[PDB]
Design a binder for this molecule. Structure first.
Ligand SMILES: [Cl-]
Length: 127
């Protein structure tokens, strides 16, 4: 599915992302916009043989297991296929582990380049 902006904000808030590990909700909404364009089924292959999966483009080298990525660590202990559900639970649970690993939201390239430093609260304004 393709979430609306406020629709995703409300779902992410219900799943505990607002202010999680220091990151207000607008950060997470902006990240999803620029990672997946709010599409729960987005996938993108990378040069290292990994693929990024779902609404938050979670990577198959470090975080989820897709069975075809060399050097897999599966630190979220989740099959990547689960991260293509229209229900965001598995992606949020893995994102919480990623953002707790020591480098904040820097794991999300699109967030680093297109959200960080902007007024991210605009992403939840009006919701
Ligand atoms: Cl604005």
């Amino acid at each position: 599915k393709v979430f609306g902006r406020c629709e995703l904000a409300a779902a992410m808030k219900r799943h505990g992302l607002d202010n999680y590990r220091g990151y207000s909700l607008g950060n997470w909404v902006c990240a999803a916009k620029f990672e997946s364009n709010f599409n729960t089924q987005a996938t993108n292959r990378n040069t290292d043989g990994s693929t990024d999966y779902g609404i938050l483009q979670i990577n198959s080298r470090w975080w989820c297991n897709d069975g075809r990525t060399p050097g897999s660590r599966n630190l979220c202990n989740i099959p990547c296929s689960a991260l293509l559900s229209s229900d965001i639970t598995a992606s949020v649970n893995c994102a919480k582990k990623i953002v707790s690993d020591g480098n904040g939201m820097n794991a999300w390239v699109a967030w680093r380049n297109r959200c960080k430093g902007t007024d991210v609260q605009a992403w939840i304004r009006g919701c």
